[PDB]
Design a protein around this ligand. Structure first.
Ligand SMILES: [Zn+2]
Length: 413
């Protein structure tokens, strides 16, 4: 209750037909319909999902996004059936402001958005915002065309936040007002305004790019305005060492994919732990998806065969090591033989220590989650999307376990 965690949908599902040894799948399986979200792999890894209108409408994300078939199925069957959401979970609707950040005004009318939230049957709907990227550095003061723009987008958000509260008066979702700002004081302004209109429920927007200190100073500035009944939501944020601090400062709700993004986007610390100490995933790339190796082949540096064999030997060693049938010593040698090649020799010696730690500590054996216990050493291999996203899923469950731990603490004396 005291702090809910919502998982933002960015088509992050896994293919349960993936053969980890052979690296084939069932080619006749349909994307999304036949795939698993985290809540289909774990009992309860979040309290709900957050669905963006811009993402569902395909135009936004810039990517392997919602197809027209997926989109029709969404509305045809309802978004509960689409996501296979259990009844103990909840849903929050969003517009996907990040998708139209560089446009003049938001491209949707308020009436459309309410249409979407009503037909999706979401528990919570977030007002149609326009993001204010940028926040004043220490002893920086925005002026001129920069300040006029910030103030313009603040006015557009609050204009629309008020339209949205009014036009959504007979809807079944609880409405959430979006607060943007370029400093602590502009954020406070936005929040005062929204509460004044009659919002009980606030979304602090545009906070993802900020350091934690900047977030915590803004919240300590907003805390006086908050009431017994006021809900506060941090769009995009999940920084688990700061949970206790957010609860102090009146936050009731967070949402983020960054634990999942972190599994494959970071160089070090791909595999999180509840200790909070983390492990580097071991790079073993597909020889014919790697840019670095495409070029080495093309340039005549290695025969294609020997590449393919060094790749195999590293994958084989890893598997042997996890059946306790190969020394850590010799496992490293196979893996580093391949690293020598897709990253160069000196880079191999750099990452040796990090690898000794990951492989030696066997941290995937420690973790009780269903990914680690089902795919083993594969969770700590950085290869294709199938391993990377499963590691992501592990990170999601780890974050939610950290959150439940914090919620378990009651002050007394
Ligand atoms: Zn795990």
């Amino acid at each position: 209750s005291k702090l809910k965690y919502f998982f933002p949908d960015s088509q992050d599902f896994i293919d349960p037909s993936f053969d980890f040894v052979r690296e084939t799948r069932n080619e006749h399986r349909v994307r999304q319909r036949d795939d698993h979200y985290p809540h289909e792999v774990f009992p309860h890894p979040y309290d709900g999902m957050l669905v963006s209108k811009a993402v569902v409408d395909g135009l936004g994300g810039g990517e392997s996004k919602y197809t027209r078939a997926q989109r029709l199925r969404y509305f045809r069957n309802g978004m509960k059936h689409f996501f296979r959401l259990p009844d103990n979970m909840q849903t929050m609707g969003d517009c996907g402001a990040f998708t139209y950040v560089n446009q003049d005004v938001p491209p949707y009318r308020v009436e459309e958005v309410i249409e979407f939230y009503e037909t999706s049957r979401f528990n919570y709907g977030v007002s149609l915002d326009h993001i204010i990227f940028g926040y004043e550095k220490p002893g920086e003061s925005f002026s001129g065309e920069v300040l006029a723009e910030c103030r313009r987008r603040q006015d557009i958000t609050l204009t629309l936040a008020q339209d949205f509260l009014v036009k959504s008066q007979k809807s079944c979702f609880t409405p959430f007002g979006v607060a943007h700002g370029w400093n602590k004081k502009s954020y406070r302004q936005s929040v005062e305004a929204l509460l004044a209109m009659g919002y009980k429920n606030i979304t602090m927007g545009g906070m993802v790019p900020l350091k934690t200190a900047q977030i915590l100073e803004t919240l300590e500035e907003i805390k006086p305005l908050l009431k017994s009944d006021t809900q506060v939501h941090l769009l995009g944020i999940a920084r688990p060492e700061s949970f206790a601090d957010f609860i102090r400062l009146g936050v009731t709700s967070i949402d983020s994919t960054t634990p999942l993004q972190q599994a494959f986007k970071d160089r070090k610390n791909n595999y999180h732990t509840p200790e909070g100490r983390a492990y580097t995933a071991v790079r073993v790339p597909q020889f014919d998806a790697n840019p670095s190796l495409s070029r080495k082949i093309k340039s005549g540096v290695i025969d294609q065969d020997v590449a393919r064999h060094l790749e195999k030997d590293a994958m084989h060693a890893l598997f042997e090591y996890d059946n306790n049938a190969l020394s850590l010593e010799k496992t490293l040698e196979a893996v580093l033989a391949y690293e020598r090649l897709h990253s160069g020799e000196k880079e191999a010696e750099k990452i040796r220590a990090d690898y000794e730690r990951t492989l030696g500590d066997r941290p995937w054996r420690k973790c009780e989650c269903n990914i680690c216990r089902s795919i083993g050493i594969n969770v700590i291999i950085f290869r294709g999307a199938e391993r990377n996203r499963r590691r992501g899923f592990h990170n999601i469950q780890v974050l939610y376990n950290r959150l439940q731990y914090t919620l378990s603490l009651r002050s007394e004396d």
